[PDB]
Structure formats: C-alpha cells, structure tokens
Amino acid sequence: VNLIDPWIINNFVQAPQGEFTISPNNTPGDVLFDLQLGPHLNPFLSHLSQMYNGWVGNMRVRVVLAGNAFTAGKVIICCVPPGFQSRTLSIAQATLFPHVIADVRTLDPVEVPLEDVRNVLYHNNDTQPTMRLLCMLYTPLRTGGASGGTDSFVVAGRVLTCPGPDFNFLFLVPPTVEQKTRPFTVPNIPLKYLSNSRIPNPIEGMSLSPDQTQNVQFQNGRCTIDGQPLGTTPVSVSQLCKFRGRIRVLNLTELDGSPFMAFAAPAPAGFPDLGSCDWHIEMSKIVTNSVKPNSQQFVPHLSSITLDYIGTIQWTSPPSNTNFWKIPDYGSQLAPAVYPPGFNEVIVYFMASIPGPNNLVPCLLPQEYITHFISEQAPIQGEAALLHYVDPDTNRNLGEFKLYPGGYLTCVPNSSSTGPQQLPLDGVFVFASWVSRFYQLKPVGTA
Amino acid sequence: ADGATGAGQLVPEVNTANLIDPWIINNFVQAPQGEFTISPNNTPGDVLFDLQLGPHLNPFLSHLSQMYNGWVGNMRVRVVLAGNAFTAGKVIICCVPPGFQSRTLSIAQATLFPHVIADVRTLDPVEVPLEDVRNVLYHNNDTQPTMRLLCMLYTPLRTGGASGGTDSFVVAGRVLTCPGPDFNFLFLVPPTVEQKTRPFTVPNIPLKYLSNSRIPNPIEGMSLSPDQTQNVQFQNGRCTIDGQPLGTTPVSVSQLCKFRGRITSGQRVLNLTELDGSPFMAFAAPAPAGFPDLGSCDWHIEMSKIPNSSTQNNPIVTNSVKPNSQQFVPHLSSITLDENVSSGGDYIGTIQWTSPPSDSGGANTNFWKIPDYGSSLAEASQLAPAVYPPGFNEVIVYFMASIPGPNQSGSPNLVPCLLPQEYITHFISEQAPIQGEAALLHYVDPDTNRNLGEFKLYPGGYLTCVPNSSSTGPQQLPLDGVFVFASWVSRFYQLKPVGT
Amino acid sequence: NLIDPWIINNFVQAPQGEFTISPNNTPGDVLFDLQLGPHLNPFLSHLSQMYNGWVGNMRVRVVLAGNAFTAGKVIICCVPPGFQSRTLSIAQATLFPHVIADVRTLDPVEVPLEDVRNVLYHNNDTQPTMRLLCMLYTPLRTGGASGGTDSFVVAGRVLTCPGPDFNFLFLVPPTVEQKTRPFTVPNIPLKYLSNSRIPNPIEGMSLSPDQTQNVQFQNGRCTIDGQPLGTTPVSVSQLCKFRGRITSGQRVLNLTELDGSPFMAFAAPAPAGFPDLGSCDWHIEMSKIPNSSTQNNPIVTNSVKPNSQQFVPHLSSITLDENVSSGGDYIGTIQWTSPPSDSGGANTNFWKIPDYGSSASQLAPAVYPPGFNEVIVYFMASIPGPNQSGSPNLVPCLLPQEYITHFISEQAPIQGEAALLHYVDPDTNRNLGEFKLYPGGYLTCVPNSSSTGPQQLPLDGVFVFASWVSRFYQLKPVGTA
C-alpha cells in the first residue's frame, strides 16, 4: 500500500541540516554534516509521521557538491551503525565503516543509501538512536585559484534525502494528540514590546557580557525548552517580580496565596532575583519599604524579610556601583549558572532600564517565551536549537542564534565590541531545527 | 575513477600500467601508515611512504594480529593521489625483495625493481600488489624482513598554470590497503600480549593536566626555542616512542627532579644514590635516575633526612649546587654543595629555585643547556644524543613549565621539555613498536573537536611542527587539547603550518 | 562472519573466571554472577572490540578444586533477563535451568548459557541478558580436617566457549568504542610509582594502625572506570599544590585553580590537587607564579593550620599564619608537616583529612574496610617533618597516581564486583600476593597474621590484573607467620 505520496518517494528534499561548506582552511578530519535516520529528515515525512505511530524502512541520501574541474579534494561519507558511541572518529577510522569517498569535482550528486539497521521490529516515535550518516573531509580542498592560500573559494554541499521504496508508516493515530511527535517552535512575537525576565519592563536593548564571558546564574527566566520553569520563575508578567505574604518579620507565601514549600523551589514564585542592589519594594496591603538582601535574616528557604499584602520593587538602589550579573545569597535547589560553551559563543542578554541611581538590568529569556514553552510540551531534539533573528519587514535573517535546552541563547560576535548589540530591536525570533556543538554559528555583527 | 565526469579530461583518469571477515577482504581501508603528502619542496628520491608487508598494514588485520601468532598471503595496496589539474609530477612505487637491504634508494635504482610510475593527477587510485615472497612457510611477528613497498617522488611536483603557494598546492595522498584473497592467520595466541602487534597510542588527557618531564610542575604552554635551529641535549624528557627511556629519565613524576645521597657531618660532598636508596652505578647512566638537568643555572636545593629520625625541628636544609663547578661530577656519584651541612645522614631533596649561573660571566639562566656531567666518554653510559631539529622548515616543539627563581630578563622562568612525563610513562608501560619514520599527531580540542594543529612525533621522542610565520606558532594554541595519533607518516611529510 | 573454529571447540578461562567456595559461605551465597556476552571470553572480547553487535549462545564449564574432605553441592542456574526477584533462595534456583555439581566432581561441569532475548540482536551496550548464577546448594562442610575448616577454600575456575550459534553483527573501528575496552593496570613496578596524596615515590605497602579504621582521603580517589572523586588531580604535578591571590600585607589566601582559573565551589570540595594532609600543620613554601623577580630568592615560607576555623578551602579562602609582604598569584606546595596545634598535643595523624569548611557535602565517599577479614592496603610515601614518636613520616595512599592516570586515560568499564590483582615479581613471574581492587578505587587484601601483611612484600613487584571477582572472593592470605 502506498501510504506516502508517490511524489515524495521519487523526488529528493533538503535535509534540515543540509548546508555544509568546504573551505581551504578546513583540515582533513573536519566534520561536514551528521545525519540520523528518521522521518524528521524529510519535512514531508515528518508531517505524516505526526499522524502515524511507527515508521520503518530505508531512505536514500544524496549529497550535491558544487565545484569545477580546477579543484581537488575528497569527502568520505560513512554509515555509523546505531548504538556505536564514540567522541569523534578520524579520517582513518571513517574508512573502517562502509563508506563512499566522493571527489569534490564530481559532476553528478553522490547517492549514499541509509539502511535501517535496527534492533526492534519497527521504530517507535521517540529519540531511540538509529543509523547515523556522518560525512568528513577526507583530503584538503586544494583549489587552483591564482590567490595564494585561500581564494575565498568554498565548495558548498547540500544534503538531499528521500524515502526509499521500503519506507512505511505502521499504525494510524489521531494526529497532533500524542506529545511524543508534537513539533516545537519559537513563539512568533515582535521583540519591540517584549518583557524582561527579571523586571516587568519592556526591553531596552540586547547586549552580551560587559567583557568576554562570565558565569551568570539567573533563576528568573529559567525555563526548559520542553516547558519546565526553574527557580522562582513566574508563569506570567503579572506575577513577574511580584511577591506577597504577611506582615515585624515578613512571610513569603506564594503569590497565588497557597502555602509555599521550600522543597519544590529555592524561593517562592515571583521572588525577585536582583543581586548586588537594595530593593525599595512596594509592600502594598500603598506602603513603601526597603529590603536588604545582604541581611542574614533574608533567607529564600525560610521566609524572613526585614523592614525599615502584595510586594513589588518600586525602584532599585546600590547595595548597602550596582552589579546585577550576580545572584543574591540563598539560604539549596538553586537554578544553574550558564557557561558559554566552546570558542566565543557568548550568551546574549536583554537589557532593561529601571529608574533610580545613574541602570540596565540583564535578562536571559522573555516571559512570553517561557509561557509559550510551558504551553507546548514538546520534546527537545539534538543538542541545541538554531534560531533566526528574522525581520518581519524584509523577511531576512539579520542574525542567527543557537538556543539551548538550559533556557538561554548564545551567539558568536564578529569582534569584542561588534556583536548582537548591532542587531535591530524590531526583529522576530523563529526556530529552524536542532543542532549540536558541531554546528558552529557564523559570526554575528557588522564590523 | 570518481570525479572523471567533472574532471573534463584534464587529468589522467586511469594509470596506464576463511577466518577473515568477508567485508575486510572486499573493501579497501586506510592503512595506519596511510597518509603522505607531495610538495614542491620535496626533491626526487624523497620517500613518500615506506610500507613493510604484514598485518600492521590494515587496521582490521592489525587488530586481529594481536590475537594470532603468524600470518601469510599477499596484500593489495591502493595509492589514492589525485592532485589538482594544474600540478605536474610523477611518483614511482617499487617492490624490493625482503633479502635486499640498502635503507636508501635512488630514483634510478627504483626503476630496477618491479615498479609502477603514476601521475600525481591520476583520478583512479593506483592499485599495486604487495606480493609475499618468503623462504619460510609462514611469518611470525618477529620483525623478520618482508617485502617492502617503497614510494618515492619520481619527478618534482612543479605546480604551474595557477601561480599559487606551496601549501596551497601540496598534494595530499592516502594509502588504502586490503588483504589479499589468500591472506591467512595461523596460530591463536593470548590477545595483546606480544610486543610486535601492539598498536601505538597516546594518552587521552588534556595537556593542561599533563606534567613536565624535567621539573615536577604543570605544563603552562608550548613554545619554541629562542633560536629555532638549536640543538637540545636534555637528559630527563628523553624516551623513545617504543618506550626505552634514555639518559636519566625517570618513569614517574615523583622521582623527576629529586636527588638522594649520603653526606658526612660537617662536609659539603654529597655521595649520590638512587631515589629508592639503592647504590648508584656509573655505567648505568650519566646520573642517578631523576637527577636534575637544568644547566646554565645555580641550583638551590632543599634537602631533608629521608628516614625522618628527628622529632622536633624543621627538617628542611637549604643549600646550593653550582653545576659549572668542576666538583660537580654526578657520573662519579659525588657533588659538592656550596655550604657545609652540620648533620650527616641520608639526604633527599629537590631543586627549590634557580638563579643565573655564578662564575660564568654573568650569563642568564639558559634552561636549554644541560650541566656538564662527569667524564662519561670512557664509560659505556654517556649523555643521550642531542635532538637536532629536522629540516623542511620544522621546529621542535617544547612544553614549558615554571620553576621558581629570578632571571636577568625578568621573564617567566620556563623549563622546556621535549615530551610530557605522562606520555613518557605511557610509552614505557605500553611498548608499542614503530611502524613509520614519524607519527602524525593531531592537537585537537576535546569538546569542539576542531583540529588546532598537526604535529609530527619522531621516534627519538620529540615533537616537531611547522610554524605558520615568524609568529611564535604553537604557543598560541590553547592548553586544553589532546594529542590524537592520526597516522604513521614518512619523515618527508609536510605538516600544515600551525598558528596564525 | 565465522569465528575461528579453535575458539568454538576449546574452552578458555573467562575474565570473570575466578570464584572461591569457603567454609564461611552459607547456602545461597552467589559465588559468581556472569551476564552473557562477548566479554565472557578473552578471544571474543577482542573480536567484540572489532564489532558493534553480538548474537548467540555461549557454553560455560566450571572446574572446582576440592579434596575429598570437602563435601558440598553447587547449583549453577540460568536466570532469564527481566526477572524481577532479587532474592533467589536455594530452593527457587532449581526451578531455573540449572546443573547441580558436587564440589569434588574431579571433572569440569558444563552449563549451557542460552541467549534469551526479545530483540533481534544484542548491541554492545549494557542491557539485561541471560545471567548465569552459581550459588552454594548445600553447606560446604570440611569435616575431619582441623585445618581444613578454616583455610581450605575450594577454588573454582569458570571456562567459557561460544556455541556454534554465536555471530558478530557489524564491523567497527577497533578499540574506539568504550564498553568493549578491557581493564588493564599499568605494567610498571611499584618502585617507580608515585603516591597519590603527596608527590613522592612509594616506599612500601602498609596497613592502617587500626584494621577497621575507615578513611576518607580526598586525593587519590579515582574509580576503576576513570572517574576521579574529590579533589583528585590527573597528574602528579598538581598534587599537594595550591594557587591563589593574596593582597599585600595580609595573611588570607584566596584559592584559585592550579592553572590560574576561578574555582567552582559546587564542583569539588577544594581546588583540584589541594592537599588533604589533615590532622597536621602545613608549613608551605610559595612563589609568584609569573617570575617578575630578577634579584632575590622568590620562595616565601609560611604555615597553614587546617584545624583553624578560618581554614575553609571550600569557600576558596584559607588564611596563612604569617603576613605576606607582597601581593600576587602565589603557587606553593607543602614543604613539611608538624604535629597539629590547638589539638591537645595530638600526633601528626595522616589518616584524617582536613575539615575543608564544607557546609551539603560533596566530599569523596568514605571508604570502609570490607568484612571477611579483609583490610585495606595503603601505599606509604615519606614527607619531611617531625612527629611525636620519631618514626618515619609516612603518609597513606589508596592508589598510586600512575594507576589513577591510567584509569582516567583508559576508561575501561567495570565488568565485575571487584578486580583481583596479582602482585607479580617481574623477574621471576611469581605471584607474591593477590589483592582485590574494588570499583570504589581502593586495594584490599587479607593479612596472614596480625604481625605480618603486605609490608613484607618486595617493592619491585608489579600488580597484574587477573580476573573480575565477586565481593565474596576469599583471597589467599599474604605475608608470613
């Protein structure tokens, strides 16, 4: 039976990670692209797989390298069996797998079959490891250009996949009712009127760390991509940076009024995360009071707040200039500090201004994004999600970002100064696909 | 020939003229010695790759050889060399018999043996049979001579018609080998016991954790010599790849820079012994194992009584040693300290700090030189041979660690060493043989897995690299990297320049 | 693919083929537990290193060495995977496919290990397969022997051979996978090996003054699979060293990592390689890590008192006794140790670790001496310094640092309850003594008498891995008298 449309079988469609470029600076052993067998490889097949329960069969993979006769270089495409765990394999080890050594100057695309080597009778819709297709640069690209060394000549490869004749979907299920195959996406909201995580104020601008990278631990805004908030991260802006309790030691019952258990969260939901700064809260029943985070009695686990009913920060003051990058002391299931991984890949922050002494507090994720993630409980694939900072006007990708399941965004600046800050504030964030540490983003910024 | 459709007839498409898993027999795989490069710097007669027939020529055969005791049969070898259409050069591949021995061959002599001449632009890999000729019925893993596949550059690679650089047209070649239809293994043996079949391996530990091999200090970075063409005669970081320490190299960091000896009360003469306390033998080595070799500096030792008889006072006794003084004769098991020591007994101590050498014209602390040991020409044991830097624009890479002590320039006091002590310990413990004139190491970042730079590890026990420019080269590399053994390569292998 | 016919037709000793039946073994005790896989056979283990998947049955033969005095029966059963029960009585064993063998059988007993599996084939990962369990069916009684009832373990060997059904599914780069890597200990004699708590050579093996004394060292704590614990450094260079910034004229040292990096309090109790020589006074020597000095002697002598409440390495700050004239990054070691101050004249007990100022605790778990008359074996190295008894200032250790470095480099998976190590003289190839290596990372033995033990063993020997053994493996006592 032909469940799949005949067109999908015959023609080839681009893989989600199907743009690898070979440059003279690339060394033999550099990973070009990595593929994992599944219906997610084909956008047409993924939509069908949402309807069905199980998939089985092989898919044909074709690699299209663009080059002319005056170039040399070879790429090796090896089929890694499922369940084979190793950090990275060299070019020598790649030849040990069943492989195809494709020359760069090949006119016709090289077709590599992706056989469904499996242990079970058929694959369930989950993240079980399947047959892995991995391509590596075998010999360096020695172009014949007149320029010495690099000639700005790059061989661009596009990975195209199509289902094989034996591909088949197993069991029909009511579509989009099973959370296992539910797709995820970045909320489509213009950033001009987005909300800072730490403060219920509109974003003033985006910036990286003041210098290089630092470990920053912000429990506010902590939300997994799957949709699990961490720390005292309110589910709404109305509860953002808003706390309540009873009056001369203040209690910190939850904003909803329910009793707060310190076992579940380090602090009650809505508790502010402002660090090296004193808070002039509004302990309204209209009562103005100041809170000292350096006081010993201040303990998130055991509610005790000094004074000198609903509470919110009226304005900030220097602690008793101001550094918001550090988290206040906690009396601990605290949220985890984020380390920019690998070379560059700084973590972007959403600056927001609060009136007071002369102020721009940072952020990690918009509250609306947290709500969108909570609403859609879809699984996370790969290692990281790649995002475009697309402008709704021109529909062009001014900048690109990598989103991690830890609940923060990363990007590579062009230089120390030039980076994500140069990007306009009117852009819209979207979701492309799931990438890994292998995918190193191109530098962001105009320099 | 892959690429013939897109080559446009610009290159020669094709050269003119049981117990083994069936997949290994039918499919060609890269040899462990299967990486060679052809560069315009190469002169005719340069050995691109030297192959000795045996199971070590195939990684699958190499792994099985650790299980078996013998082998027979021929081997099929494919030379993958498809250079740019602009290049112009020819290579020659010969098959010298095992009985023949010259260890060097002119290009004219190579044509005498059964040979094949291949263009460097040959799209289809050149398949040459490595026939097995032998008097004995089967070969053991006993380093007996076997038929050799010699590949030397016949005509120089004069890239033209494009006006590019050298590295921009260095032709990279790969050697793919698969066992013949009748390659067999004879006798089963306990796995990975025999020395001959062991594979070469470097520890998978980041360089930051690794230790220096001349002072017991963490490695703070790689660097080159003040003069890149400088011979070095260290006696502590010396250890062959196959794992016999040379000079006074200790196995472990504990006995690296320490010395032990017995001194009479009220005297400055120190009668050296081994670290464990056993008597030292002059004919064994120039100095007791782990003796410091920081030459051209004034040592400042902190000795102590090893058995710890004392119960009250601070046991650290600080004295100084002048290696430039004539009485400094460790080969005779006697060194004289600068100050007399009141208490006599077995003393063990290290080097605390170093100052610019005294009575030497006010010279700086030249850590690249070694102290003049005692008279060792007469005795069998003498200094380890100096490691001269190879040609082909290659510079020895040194690992630098800090030792306390002032220097005339106010610069950090870095003691260079050829290899990290962890590598030396690994080589000593696992005595893998040597299958090529050099080992092609890759300095790769463990997490991002980007090839920071490629290094050649010579059997003498030192790392070489090609600096990119007059810049410091490998020093710019991050310390959180791991060396991974890529392949066995010939001496004439041209490394990709490292650094920016 | 076909296995070599000799392997199919000959039994070889398994890497887990050592078990002992001892008078002090109640019925139902598990002598040896084997999970079916290619790792059961040394030849098949190499073949697995070259392959990704395996399928098929294996044949197991058990040889029991017992004189006619030992009367007992052992039942070897074949429990299928997915069996929920953990407590298997001797009565319940007979329900499974089992072979009941007398301890004096005089001929090998063969039990078929079938491959019962729901999947088409077996990957190289760790999954529940058929498990062969050997349990003592009837109490082992050595009646008639006054000396037999105490020192007559019936040694047993497990020999395994693949059946004709065994096959290896897919070709893979050899030795690159992790679970197939065999476990090896460095072939370097103990003379040259270094201590893992101080960077000094090992002087000899010794026991604790109290045979039941628990130890919680932070340095030299690495599991067999190469996972360091506590503040254990990879190499000897970073042992008993510390680096930090101290302001000029002060006495507080703000600890950083050995490579001039910020120290994460949550990750480790102290910076990597920080000394754990507790219950003693440290007399440190320090020097500025960048040599900005051209004239004077850079070493500065100071002292640290770990018992002081200000000594809090976990909060990345320890206060030296004396003021430091000039500020900067100082690297330094422990020059010598003295009996601890403010402790009522207590001796320099090196078997205790400093407080570390921990406030949950991420310290390395405390290692306890196992039962069955087993005592932990420690390696001693000398650090300079006085003691209240005039004895050598030997610091204990759990594993030589070369072993730790090898384990970290070679992340060999743990395939048994414990690893039996033979102490072999390299020249004569004689097993002077046999030791058990536990997955926690400590080496234990059994002393022949209270007056003897591993201390009499020569220092030139080298530990050679023998087999994986259960916790109940009764070692042959080491020493004399």
One letter per element, helices H and strands E, the order of chain A comes to HEEHEEEHEEEEEEEEEEEEEHEEEE
What percent of residues of chain A are in strands? 25-35%
The dominant shape of chain A is: globular
Oligomer status? part of a larger assembly
Report the sheet with the most strands of chain A, covering strand number, pairing sense and barrel closure: 5 strands, antiparallel
Number of helices, counting only DSSP H or I runs of 4 residues or more of chain A: 4
Tell me roughly what share of residues is in helical segments of chain A.
under 10%
**Order of the strands making up the biggest sheet of chain A:** 17-21-20-19-22
How widely separated are the two ends of chain A?
Answer: 57 Å
Number of strands of chain A: 22
The radius of gyration of chain A is 26 Å
The biggest chain-chain interface is: B-C, 76 and 75 residues
Provide the structure class of chain A: mainly beta
PDB class: virus
Keywords: norovirus, GI.4, virus like particle, human monoclonal antibody, Fv-clasp, virus
Entry title: Cryo-EM structure of the GI.4 Chiba VLP complexed with the CV-1A1 Fv-clasp
Chains A, B, C: VP1
